[PDB]
Amino acid sequence: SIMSYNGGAVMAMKGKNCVAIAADRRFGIQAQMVTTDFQKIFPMGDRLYIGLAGLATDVQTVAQRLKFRLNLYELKEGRQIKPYTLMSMVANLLYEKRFGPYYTEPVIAGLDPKTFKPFICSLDLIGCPMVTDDFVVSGTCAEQMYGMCESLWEPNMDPDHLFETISQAMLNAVDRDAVSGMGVIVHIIEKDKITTRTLKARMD
Amino acid sequence: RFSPYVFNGGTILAIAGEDFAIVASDTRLSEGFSIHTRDSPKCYKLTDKTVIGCSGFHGDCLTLTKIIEARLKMYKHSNNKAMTTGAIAAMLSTILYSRRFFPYYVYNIIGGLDEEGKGAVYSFDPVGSYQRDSFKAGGSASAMLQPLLDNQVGFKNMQNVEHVPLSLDRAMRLVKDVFISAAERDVYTGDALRICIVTKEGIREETVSLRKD
Amino acid sequence: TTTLAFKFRHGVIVAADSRATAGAYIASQTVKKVIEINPYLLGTMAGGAADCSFWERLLARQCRIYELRNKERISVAAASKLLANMVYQYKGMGLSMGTMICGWDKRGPGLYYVDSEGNRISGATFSVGSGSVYAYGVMDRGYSYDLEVEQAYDLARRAIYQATYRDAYSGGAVNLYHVREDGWIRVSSDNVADLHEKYSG
Amino acid sequence: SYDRAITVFSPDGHLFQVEYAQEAVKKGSTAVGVRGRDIVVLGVEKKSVAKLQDERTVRKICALDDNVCMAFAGLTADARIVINRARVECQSHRLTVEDPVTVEYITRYIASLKQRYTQSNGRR
Amino acid sequence: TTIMAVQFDGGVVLGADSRTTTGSYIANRVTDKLTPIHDRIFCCRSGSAADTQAVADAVTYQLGFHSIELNEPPLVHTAASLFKEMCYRYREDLMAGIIIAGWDPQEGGQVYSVPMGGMMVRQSFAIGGSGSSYIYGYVDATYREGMTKEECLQFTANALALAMERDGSSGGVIRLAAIAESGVERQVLLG
Amino acid sequence: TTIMAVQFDGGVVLGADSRTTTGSYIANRVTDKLTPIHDRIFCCRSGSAADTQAVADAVTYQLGFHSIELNEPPLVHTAASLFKEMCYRYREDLMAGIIIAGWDPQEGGQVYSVPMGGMMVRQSFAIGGSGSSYIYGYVDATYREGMTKEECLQFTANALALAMERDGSSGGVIRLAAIAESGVERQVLLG
Amino acid sequence: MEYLIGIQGPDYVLVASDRVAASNIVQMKDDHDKMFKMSEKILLLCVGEAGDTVQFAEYIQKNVQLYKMRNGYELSPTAAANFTRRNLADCLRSRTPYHVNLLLAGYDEHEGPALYYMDYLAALAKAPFAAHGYGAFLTLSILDRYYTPTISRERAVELLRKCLEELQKRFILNLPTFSVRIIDKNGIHDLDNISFPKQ
Amino acid sequence: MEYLIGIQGPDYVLVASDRVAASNIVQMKDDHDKMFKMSEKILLLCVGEAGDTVQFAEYIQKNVQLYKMRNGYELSPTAAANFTRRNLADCLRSRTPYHVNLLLAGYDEHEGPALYYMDYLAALAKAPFAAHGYGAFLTLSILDRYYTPTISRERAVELLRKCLEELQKRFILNLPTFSVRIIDKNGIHDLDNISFPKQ
Amino acid sequence: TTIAGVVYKDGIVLGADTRATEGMVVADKNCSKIHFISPNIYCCGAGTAADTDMTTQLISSNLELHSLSTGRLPRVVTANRMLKQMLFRYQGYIGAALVLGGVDVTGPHLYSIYPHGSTDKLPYVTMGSGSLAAMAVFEDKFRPDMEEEEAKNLVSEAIAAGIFNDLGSGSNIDLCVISKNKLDFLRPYTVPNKKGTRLGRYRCEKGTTAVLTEKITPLE
Amino acid sequence: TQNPMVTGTSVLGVKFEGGVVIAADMLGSYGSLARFRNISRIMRVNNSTMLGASGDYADFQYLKQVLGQMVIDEELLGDGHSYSPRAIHSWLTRAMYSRRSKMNPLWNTMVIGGYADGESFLGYVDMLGVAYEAPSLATGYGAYLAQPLLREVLEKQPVLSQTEARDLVERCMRVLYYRDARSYNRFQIATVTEKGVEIEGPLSTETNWDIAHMI
């Protein structure tokens, strides 16, 4: 298919007063890797990230049109954007190409800036937003990632056990996929600091 | 026009143990968007030491089961003993290949005991290739069940974790939990969970309810 | 899928990976792609896993009948010729088969390559599979006829490691055999994740 | 399709058509063969020439391959069709297993052709 | 193309048009679609022309040999069962709209319908052909239980006159046949 | 799906079924296919459901603005000419079986037929829809010149009853409307 | 896809082909042999798809060898080439037709040297020189530029040398080596495996 | 269809391509140049179909030259490579999309050497080494076999030598010659036009 | 997807399930399918989920503009006319099946809008994939002028029929009661299907995952 | 059968306490046309089993012919043995599967009711060879419309009396008359008991059209 042309996997998971996001590192064309440091998670202000998965053009294209509209928002207004507001901004951006659609599926994760409350959502390729309270996934290996998160997620998790759950959810689901792998990067954010770790995965 | 195939869903699961073999499956038969019945298991007892699971097109699963049960009788009338578990798997590989150019749309997993009282799991493709494994999951939700058992049974992707073999008690609650996660996200996984346990003394059965969407 | 085989002074080396996929889903990681026809012949699995499994089991039946009638073992040239003729009768019907036939013979080492289309060729080095072109590049650099035994083990082991690194459908563990005078001997079976820490430093 | 048992057992355990055929051999001309350690030598006798016939058309030493010669006795009509079926088999061996035919292999083809032919229906 | 059969108490009444088209050209301007099989058993044929002529001769072969062997005049249900066997075995190759009607000494007049599928059913009145769709509403309101013979000849004449006027593939002249115990009265009618 | 309009001397009589199908499922079990445009001008619509609803509102927009500007009750031929212009310009996109009928002070009752092509013709009685093919033979023999109003309500009731019984796509309940100089008498009938 | 050539002289036949066994994008084998003996003075040069070149051409070989054992003497090159044409043409209108292009070369004691030409539709042609493959479009124009009916075998080799140097100038495939035979009154003789060093 | 390579070092970028301009079965030109300068420290290497490689790549060249005349200083290699990606991606969902595969090489005074990778779908990739063409399947496995991040430019050439000798061993196309550049703190330098003598 | 509506003696009861299935995989378990239009008019959506969202927001924006200009309460026939004039313009390429209901001055009004632009006023309607199972409950047990306790009991039974008989449906049942003076929107009306409880403890501790590289960046 | 010419429609069936009841209408459609309006779509097999069918009607007369012969030739053996209803269900399953395997199917869908040895039997048979058992069955559009009405009674009340079942069928036949374009208001009800097989006459429904006065 078109989504399986480059592969990819993005997972977000909600914790107690924190939220983690993870993605793979492989860039490739249908059978053949090219590099293992392809960026798929982009910062949108402090304590608010976005992950993109799908066609590798629209990963780099939408992440630049969205940054274009975001800086004009935060200069016309005097404040940073709420996590709920960005979801309506992306859903506008994808729906304008209703018949010329971008082949990507965004995943948004971040904390609310005033009251530090987590927020996760995901969108299809024409912008149907879906907010949840436990986890959202996007990419080619979606069904493998549902078997992980339905069996491993707990309601109230400190950032230590939140890291261990989203790591074991990614290292086993991506290992079962063929066109996704070659490393996993994990961002875990919270109101005081922010933490980026890279996992020891199979380069197989 | 007339298409000869349809997908009826279903999900089977087998785990080989040290002195046991557990085979489980759902009990929902359904094609399209409708429901035919809420009671149609896939646990088929071949001998007292071998249970087969059959998922896929249900018209082929009915036929293939009756072909096998005839040939177990033809072996005994010609050799004065029952088939072993490894002999069944070598036989059924030839049966599936015999219709190479009009294949069965059936996924097969054979669980049972060997000659030494150890577990054995043989998983098949619809053409008839196989190997012996410790655990396999076949059917519609096979993409959801296989990553979970790599973590728990295979002890994969973990650090500083001791390697204890799976007991019978741990393997029961491991099976019961993994279908509850599969029934949430799969539309095909059904309502009752028929679990068949093959030991050195016979075959026990157990039925566990699920949600009924 | 990636297999390779090359012959040298001290017999024939056979190696393969163990990943079998289904679309983008990985079915298993432990598929033994070098099947054991005899105590003196070896065959690989490339393309259709069930078609290579059937027709090479059917070849092992046929070679055993030849030995009982003639009271010596079959040659490597005769064994591949039987396999090339059985497959040709189903040409165009859609068989996927790209195996190789290895084994010691009265004329020395033997290494032939049999297709489902009807190709039957000799040679010194071969590499079959989806990631076969990744195996040729590293194998052509370190190949010599006069390799040592422990050196030829390291060549074929690292050559599979480079193919699984680039190809998406290749991976698992690295099986490794050695065809000798009396018969084949299983050498080792290394995981790729263990070779990654070995070959890095 | 002529279906009739020609070769049947006797009441004392013989096959009469087989041992009647061994007397047809017992009045064909004599053929002798010995083997040396480096050169074999076989040669028929009783050419019985009439000095008005072509000497090559009456030959009874023929070759199945380069390495395999053949002599016979008995009646010559049945001989040269056993030879022509043996030439086909030793040629089709080369399309199979690449070495030329061993001399032991071609006699198992002839003897098994000759046995099952005392077993079929409607064949002397 | 437009065929019709109505029974009454003593027998049956058959009727058909006479136009045979080839796409849009009138190949045969007058056509006898009422084929005799036996002396008291007719059929009226529709659909493909070469198919229904070949089947009607094979049934005439089989029924004539059947009746000369039993030495007894054959049944209408017997003749209808023979068309069913050929139209069902060869349903992938035939386009036949056969209606079998006729008088029998044991049961009187019968009317059977064998459409293009290959089934068979007895009816009080049958109707078939391409132009038969335009007179379903007329034949439902006008039909009355227990007619005489002279009303059934009037009833099938008005019904064929309306389908011939409205359909393009029907037309020509109306052929009628009344089968009773006494014999067969055929006539050619127009208007 | 099965619509019908018959004029008499003082006015017209309209009738339609109430079944709206989606392939083989009954989407709407009761449906008003008799759409008012003006106070003495109706239309009954068939073919595509979303197409004929959109055209009937655009003509109602144009005819209402036309009559308020001339300050005079509009003509039936005027309203029929507006459906012709939209169904001909957009004949590649529409599937409409519109029949326009109604009373006019200058000419009495008129009945116009606009089929799927986009033409227009005045008739004494019109008939349309999918199930209208099965009652062509009935409506030809039963129709009689110079009926009263009470006979035309009987005449369209029996004709819709036969098509609803024989067609699968028609069915439900019969809606009738009689338009005269005095006004419009609508009624819902069954049987 | 791959190439062979047919120079025929007054009392000899000079044939040559490449040595490359191809694959998807790689070459499996660099010393392949397209040359099939049937008799002591008859060769066979077969080009086509994968399975049909090996099995059809050795099916011919078992019938030519059988003719010599049944009779004592060999076929002529004319009858051998005209026996192969019957076997394609019968198997052409069938469920499994062979798709091979070939040219046969032979010497006889009566009519001297002979060269025949065939395709995958079984048309014979007695030709003084011929070629198959896509390189035949490049190399036939050099060959009729310089051909003489009375050409010696020493300068026929250097005519073949010139005809193959141009094939490595304006032709996109690799083709490094070429095996050469020669047929005369004394039978088959191997010439030098001429090549171009790619080092 | 045709080949180029991207070895990148600690303070240099080593690029090379072939020189063959192809046709139906013949080669039109044997000394073609796939190499396009834009600045004194930025090259461009374009591969694709017939018309789009020449006209797109010189459309980029007139915009990079225009940036230097309007401002006085040149683009960075990062901004130059990220300007080209915008021009494919805008022209992709259009009536006339360009079908070219390219990789850009540059040196900067701030961040040193840089290499980027693109395809006909406009995806960027900062890579230490890359290749296009069907020969990339053959030659990437030699290159990561022997690559060191701290590799000197003298042994990087002989690494390129080894990487091209194997391309004339198991690859069916001809490819006789290869033009080599090198980019460093002093700009573009021509190296030796390395080749393999087919005589 | 199963949406349904009814008209009782005073107002309108709307109902829907909460599931969104991408392919044959359950994506969302709590997708809200009942939307806001005006303070007296709601609408239910079926079909393409992004097409129903962006359409039900455009029309709700226009009636907010229209009612604030006229200064009075909107009418249900206005929201009908805005929808079926824009869906016909897009020629059915926007797949949006809608059940529209509200209580204006003239009373309760219930519409059903098909994605080609055809509408119809009815006393009870069902849309969605499991619409056929819900219509059989309405066809057997409808009666005109019911009280709202019978109406809430009838609709929740009809939505539950699409839960247990359709594959692409089935979770908590939403309801909304619209009357002349009261608006009761309430999502968890009933929970017919729970999740089973876990048995085995899968819990891992800190240190069971190998990490290659970590980075810490403080914030304020 | 490549293309079904004259077809039937939905067939219902439900167990009760000591017997099975099956109902279906009396219409053979042809495309969208109702040609044959007095056919019967329920066959009474010997004394304790019973068959209805949907799909192509000319294929149904074929199986009516073949099963008619398999019962006649058995009963004149005097064995004291008859076919159980699940033996016929097993036979008819093999007849479907062995005929799609030759890519020439029988365009039917069949419901087998039966009461032998104190217990009820109700079996489903598909064109492709899919077969199962259930306490309630429905084919065609009845699987979408009438089948949810069957299950919600049987899950709240597992066993039924004979009068409760016959009432519950007539409600589901009314639903299929409203919401199906291929139905007809003339049906017949067949019922097995321990006493035998009884097929009732051309029954009719009672329709309600009070919502048609709602503008």
Comparing CA positions, the residue from I8, F186, E143 lying closest to residue F173 is: F186
Closest CB to J212 among F25, F168, F188: F188
**Residue of chain G whose alpha carbon sits nearest to that of C134:** G26
Dump strand ranges (E) for J17-170.
Answer: 19-25, 28-30, 33-36, 42-44, 49-55, 108-116, 119-125, 131-133, 136-138
Comparing CA positions, the residue from G94, G15, G23 lying closest to residue G56 is: G94
Q: In whole angstroms, what separates CA E97 from the centre of its chain?
A: 9
Residue F190, number of CB atoms within 10 A of its CB: 12
Query: Which residues pair with residue C125 across a beta bridge?
Result: C6
Query: How far is F124 from F108, CA to CA, in rounded Å?
Result: 12
What residues of F are in contact with residue I84 (Cβ under 8 Å)?
50, 53-54
Q: Which two tokens stand for residue C102?
A: 């290895």
Domain carrying residue H82? 1-196
Q: Does G33 touch chain C (CB under 8 A)?
A: no
Say which residue the tokens 């009739």 belong to.
D4
What residues of I are in contact with residue A193 (Cβ under 8 Å)?
216-219
Decide: J67 and J88 in contact? Cβ < 8 Å: yes
- Give, as one character, the DSSP assignment of residue E47: B
Residue B14: exposure state from Cβ atoms within 10 A (0-12, 13-18, ≥19): buried
Closest CB to B59 among J2, J130, J143: J130
Decide: F30 and F1 in contact? Cβ < 8 Å: no
Q: Note the resolution in Å, 1 decimal.
A: 3.0
Comparing CA positions, the residue from B196, B212, B153 lying closest to residue B12 is: B196
CA distances from C38 to B86, B90, C57 (A): 20, 18, 10
Q: Which two tokens stand for residue E27?
A: 């190949």
Contact at CB, I210 and B159, closer than 8 angstroms: yes
> What is the biggest distance separating any 2 CA atoms in chain J, rounded to whole angstroms?
68
Look at strands D69-70 and E2-7 and give their pairing. Answer: unpaired
Chains I and G, touching by 3 or more CB pairs within 8 angstroms: no
Domains contained in chain A, number: 1
Dump strand ranges (E) for I17-162.
Answer: 20-22, 25-28, 34-36, 41-47, 96-104, 107-113, 119-121, 124-128
**CB < 8 Å from D in window 134-153 of G:** none
CA distance I181 to chain J (A): 24
**Residue of chain J whose alpha carbon sits nearest to that of I129:** J144
Comparing CA positions, the residue from I191, I190, I123 lying closest to residue I153 is: I190
Contact at CB, A203 and C192, closer than 8 angstroms: yes
Helices (H), J35-139: 57-75, 85-100
Helices (H), chain D: 16-25, 76-95, 103-115
Look at strands B21-26 and B192-198 and give their pairing. Answer: antiparallel
Ramachandran sector of residue F3 (left: φ over 0; alpha: ψ -120 to 50; beta: rest)? beta
What residues of G are in contact with residue C132 (Cβ under 8 Å)?
26
CA distances from I153 to B212, I150, I177 (A): 21, 5, 12
Query: Which residues pair with residue H45 across a beta bridge?
Result: H35, H103
Decide: F164 and F2 in contact? Cβ < 8 Å: yes
Decide: F31 and F47 in contact? Cβ < 8 Å: no
Query: How far is D97 from G14, CA to CA, in rounded Å?
Result: 32
CA distances from B27 to A182, B14, E125, H60, I112 (A): 39, 16, 52, 64, 38
Technique used by the depositors = cryo-EM
Comparing CA positions, the residue from G196, G167, G115 lying closest to residue G2 is: G167
Mutual angle of helices A142-152 and B142-152, in 10-degree steps: 50
Query: How far is J163 from J196, CA to CA, in rounded Å?
Result: 17
Residue J73, number of CB atoms within 10 A of its CB: 8
Q: Which two tokens stand for residue C44?
A: 């690989």
- Give, as one character, the DSSP assignment of residue E34: E
Contact at CB, C168 and A140, closer than 8 angstroms: no
Coil, helix or strand at residue D60: coil
Contact at CB, G55 and C91, closer than 8 angstroms: no
What residues of I are in contact with residue J141 (Cβ under 8 Å)?
132
Query: How far is E154 from J188, CA to CA, in rounded Å?
Result: 36
Contact at CB, E140 and F158, closer than 8 angstroms: no
Comparing CA positions, the residue from A104, A108, A152, A112 lying closest to residue A132 is: A108
H-run or E-run covering H15? strand H13-18
CA distance H143 to chain A (A): 13
Mutual angle of helices G50-71 and C76-88, in 10-degree steps: 110
Query: How far is G188 from G44, CA to CA, in rounded Å?
Result: 12
Decide: B179 and B210 in contact? Cβ < 8 Å: yes
Query: How far is A112 from A117, CA to CA, in rounded Å?
Result: 5
What residues of G are in contact with residue D94 (Cβ under 8 Å)?
62, 65
Query: How far is F109 from I198, CA to CA, in rounded Å?
Result: 78
Residue B177, number of CB atoms within 10 A of its CB: 21
Sequence-ordered list of residues with C-beta below 8 angstroms from that of F27, at least 6 positions apart, any chain:
F20, F21
Coil, helix or strand at residue J35: strand
Query: Which residues pair with residue E178 across a beta bridge?
Result: E13, E185
Sequence-ordered list of residues with C-beta below 8 angstroms from that of C26, at least 6 positions apart, any chain:
A176, A177, A178, C19, C20
Helix, strand, coil % (nearest 5) of chain C? 35, 30, 30
Residue A95: exposure state from Cβ atoms within 10 A (0-12, 13-18, ≥19): middle
Contact at CB, E133 and F135, closer than 8 angstroms: no
Mutual angle of helices C76-88 and C49-70, in 10-degree steps: 130
CA angle, C105 as apex, C104 and C107 as ends, to 5°?
125
Sequence-ordered list of residues with C-beta below 8 angstroms from that of E177, at least 6 positions apart, any chain:
E13, E14, E15, E34, E42, E184, E185, E186, E187
- Is residue C49 marked as binding? yes
Decide: F176 and F163 in contact? Cβ < 8 Å: no
Contact at CB, F137 and E139, closer than 8 angstroms: yes
| Dihedral of alpha carbons F162, F165, F166, F171, sign | positive
Query: How far is F175 from E4, CA to CA, in rounded Å?
Result: 34
Say which residue the tokens 């006023």 belong to.
I121
Query: How far is C37 from C177, CA to CA, in rounded Å?
Result: 13
Comparing CA positions, the residue from H52, H64, H54, H62 lying closest to residue H88 is: H52
Look at strands G21-22 and G27-29 and give their pairing. Answer: antiparallel
Query: How far is E51 from B62, CA to CA, in rounded Å?
Result: 42
Query: Which residues pair with residue F16 across a beta bridge?
Result: F3, F175
Query: What is the gyration radius of the CA atoms in chain D, in angstroms?
Result: 17
Decide: H53 and H98 in contact? Cβ < 8 Å: no
CA distances from J213 to E113, F173, H142, I122 (A): 43, 11, 84, 11
Domains contained in chain H, number: 1
Query: How far is A165 from D96, CA to CA, in rounded Å?
Result: 62
Comparing CA positions, the residue from I107, I102, I59, I106 lying closest to residue I81 is: I59
What residues of B are in contact with residue A148 (Cβ under 8 Å)?
147-148
State phi, psi for C162 to the nearest 5 degrees. -75, -30
Query: How far is F82 from F105, CA to CA, in rounded Å?
Result: 19
Comparing CA positions, the residue from I213, I201, I3 lying closest to residue I100 is: I3
CA distance A204 to chain C (A): 6
Chains with 3 or more CB pairs closer than 8 angstroms to H? Answer: A, C, G
Decide: J12 and J41 in contact? Cβ < 8 Å: no
How many beta-carbon contacts under 8 Å exist across D and G? 17
State phi, psi for G18 to the nearest 5 degrees. -85, -175
CA angle, D51 as apex, D46 and D57 as ends, to 5°?
70
Q: Which residues of J20-34 are buried (b: 16+ CB within 10 A; e: fewer)?
A: bbbbbbbbbbbeebb
Domain carrying residue A63? 1-204
Comparing CA positions, the residue from C126, C101, C120 lying closest to residue C43 is: C101
Q: Which two tokens stand for residue F65?
A: 């603005």
C1 flagged as catalytic: yes
| Dihedral of alpha carbons B70, B71, B73, B74, sign | positive
Mark the breaks in chain C: residue after which each occurs, C to N over 2.5 Å: none
CA distance J50 to chain I (A): 27
Query: How far is B93 from J77, CA to CA, in rounded Å?
Result: 43
CATH number at residue H171: 3.60.20.10
Contact at CB, H25 and G196, closer than 8 angstroms: no
Decide: I127 and I46 in contact? Cβ < 8 Å: yes
Q: Does I20 touch chain A (CB under 8 A)?
A: yes
Query: How far is J105 from J62, CA to CA, in rounded Å?
Result: 13
| Length of chain G, in residues | 199
Decide: J134 and J122 in contact? Cβ < 8 Å: yes
Q: Does G65 touch chain D (CB under 8 A)?
A: yes
Residue B211: exposure state from Cβ atoms within 10 A (0-12, 13-18, ≥19): middle
Query: How far is B187 from G177, CA to CA, in rounded Å?
Result: 63
Decide: F24 and J182 in contact? Cβ < 8 Å: yes
Decide: B54 and B64 in contact? Cβ < 8 Å: yes
Coil, helix or strand at residue D58: coil
CATH number at residue A165: 3.60.20.10
DSSP one-letter string for chain I = -EEEEEE-SSSEEEEE---EEETTEEEESS---EEESSSSEEEEEEESHHHHHHHHHHHHHHHHHHHHHHTS---HHHHHHHHHHHHTTTTT-S-EEEEEEEEETTEEEEEEE-TTS-EEE-SEEEEETTHHHHHHHHHHH--SS--HHHHHHHHHHHHHHHHHH-TT--SPEEEEEE-SS-EEEEEEEE-----PPP-S-----TT-S-EEEEEEEE--
Q: In whole angstroms, what separates CA B71 from the centre of its chain?
A: 20
What residues of A are in contact with residue I217 (Cβ under 8 Å)?
193-196
Q: Which two tokens stand for residue I94?
A: 């926007």
Q: How many CA atoms lie within 13 A of C96 on its CB side?
A: 12
H-run or E-run covering G140? helix G135-146
Decide: C15 and C176 in contact? Cβ < 8 Å: yes
Decide: H188 and H181 in contact? Cβ < 8 Å: yes
Mutual angle of helices B58-79 and B85-97, in 10-degree steps: 130
Residue E52, number of CB atoms within 10 A of its CB: 23
| Dihedral of alpha carbons D75, D76, D78, D83, sign | positive
Q: Which residues of H52-64 are buried (b: 16+ CB within 10 A; e: fewer)?
A: bbeebbeebbeeb
Say which residue the tokens 């066809």 belong to.
I139
**CB < 8 Å from G in window 18-57 of H:** 22, 25-27
Decide: C126 and H170 in contact? Cβ < 8 Å: no
Q: Does A57 touch chain H (CB under 8 A)?
A: yes
Residue F88: exposure state from Cβ atoms within 10 A (0-12, 13-18, ≥19): middle
Ramachandran sector of residue I217 (left: φ over 0; alpha: ψ -120 to 50; beta: rest)? beta
CA distance F23 to chain J (A): 9
Say which residue the tokens 């968890």 belong to.
I188
Chains B and J, touching by 3 or more CB pairs within 8 angstroms: yes
Query: How far is A137 from A179, CA to CA, in rounded Å?
Result: 16
Query: How far is H175 from J136, CA to CA, in rounded Å?
Result: 74
CA distances from I90 to A128, B95, I82, I146 (A): 20, 55, 13, 39
CA angle, I140 as apex, I134 and I146 as ends, to 5°?
90
Q: How many CA atoms lie within 13 A of I188 on its CB side?
A: 6
How many beta-carbon contacts under 8 Å exist across B and J? 44
